[PDB]
Design a protein around this ligand. Structure first.
Ligand SMILES: Nc1ccn([C@H]2C[C@H](O)[C@@H](COP(=O)(O)NP(=O)(O)OP(=O)(O)O)O2)c(=O)n1
Ligand SMILES: [Mn+2]
Ligand SMILES: [Mn+2]
Ligand code: NA
Ligand code: NA
Length: 326
DNA sequence: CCGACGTCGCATCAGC
DNA sequence: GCTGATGCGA
DNA sequence: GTCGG
């Protein structure tokens, strides 16, 4: 983290633009700049040095000059002082509360943690669970706990049906020493792009993880995606582990490589890779890579037998999971 | 200069 | 009820 | 907010 001060600054600008301004492309611009600067292997000494980097334009270069000369940015100094901004920015930290609801809550004079706790009846289910575990969801997960969680998820899934394959993705698969949550990719032979021979494939798994008190709460759930809450079991007289977010994605088994590419991330890596695909005239989702007809209309799914196959189509040298952390 | 900028799942609402 | 848009999230 | 064409 040679340039921690700069990337911190930009990320806070990105978060302001998303949460307060509701300007998503500015949020994306700041995040790209932050990402490209994070991996730049020199300590940056000027706005002009940084502007060489793609994603760093004129405006951000000027901010880096100010930041480097003073250690602060007056634009942020002011945002930090603004009641409305700070309130809105804070409320969005609760899972299920985004920019729209946070500004609406603020409009009704709900703007502190205490105000949320008194107005639980004004929250939807997701927001209510997010409020409940606000404290725990602030804490990161040590990789060592991630390994214990992996153990449990894989063994419980096996007990439901040995032909399930469960794969932990996200920052875990990228080798991170701590993660924000756990991401689990699920496949089963009965669910392919061509047919769903068995129903409740995700539900049965979720049910089992609840039965053993691993999954404690549900934020959302359908046939292919689960979002919820889980907790490691603790020992006698031990303090309980924090509750953790968990996401599960059931992917058609024949489309595992697109699915694991997607769920491994990072989010910025996926966005840049999909953008680059479009420049090369392909489109990538979690299921397929497809060519773009001169029209614009996507064509038929191309054969894919490895993650690398996907990289090969768009003329990118392969990158290991641990190197996709943009 | 200029829009053109990843892709999709589930919850909730509006309009019918 | 269904359809399609909006919010929030992966 | 950036920038390719
Ligand atoms: N905007 C987003 C968010 C998520 N992702 C897909 C890939 C991200 O790695 C991933 C899993 O989402 P995530 O859990 O929110 N982030 P990730 O696991 O990479 O890092 P953590 O903050 O969980 O440690 O899903 C995406 O493609 N676009
Ligand atoms: Mn994750
Ligand atoms: Mn996740
Ligand atoms: Na640049
Ligand atoms: Na939120």
């Amino acid at each position: 983290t040679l340039n921690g001060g700069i990337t911190d600054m930009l990320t806070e600008l990105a978060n302001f633009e998303k949460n307060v301004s509701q300007a998503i492309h500015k949020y994306n611009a700041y995040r790209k700049a932050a990402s490209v600067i994070a991996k730049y292997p020199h300590k940056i000494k000027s706005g002009a040095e940084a502007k060489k980097l793609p994603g760093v334009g004129t405006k951000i270069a000027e901010k880096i000059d100010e930041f480097l000369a003073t250690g602060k940015l007056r634009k942020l100094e002011k945002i930090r002082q603004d009641d409305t901004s700070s309130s809105i920015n804070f409320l969005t930290r609760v899972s299920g509360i985004g920019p729209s609801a946070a500004r609406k809550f603020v409009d009704e004079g709900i703007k502190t943690l205490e105000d949320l706790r008194k107005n639980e009846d004004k929250l939807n289910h997701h927001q209510r669970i997010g409020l409940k575990y606000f404290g725990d969801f602030e804490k990161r997960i040590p990789r060592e706990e991630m390994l214990q969680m992996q153990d449990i998820v894989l063994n419980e899934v096996k007990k439901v049906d040995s032909e399930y394959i469960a794969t932990v993705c996200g920052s875990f698969r990228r080798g991170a020493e701590s993660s924000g949550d756990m991401d689990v990719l699920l496949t089963h032979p009965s669910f392919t792009s061509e047919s769903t021979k068995q129903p409740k494939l995700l539900h049965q798994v979720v049910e089992q993880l609840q039965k053993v008190h691993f999954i404690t709460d549900t934020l959302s759930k359908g046939e292919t995606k689960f979002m919820g809450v889980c907790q490691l079991p603790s020992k006698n007289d031990e303090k309980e582990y924090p509750h953790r977010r968990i996401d599960i994605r059931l992917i058609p088994k024949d489309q595992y490589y697109c699915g694991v590419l997607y769920f491994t991330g990072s989010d910025i890596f996926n966005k840049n890779m999909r953008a680059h695909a479009l420049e090369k005239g392909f489109t990538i989702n979690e299921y397929t890579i497809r060519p773009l007809g001169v029209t614009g209309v996507a064509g038929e799914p191309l054969p894919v037998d490895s993650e690398k196959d996907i990289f090969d189509y768009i003329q990118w040298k392969y990158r290991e999971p641990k190197d996709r952390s943009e």
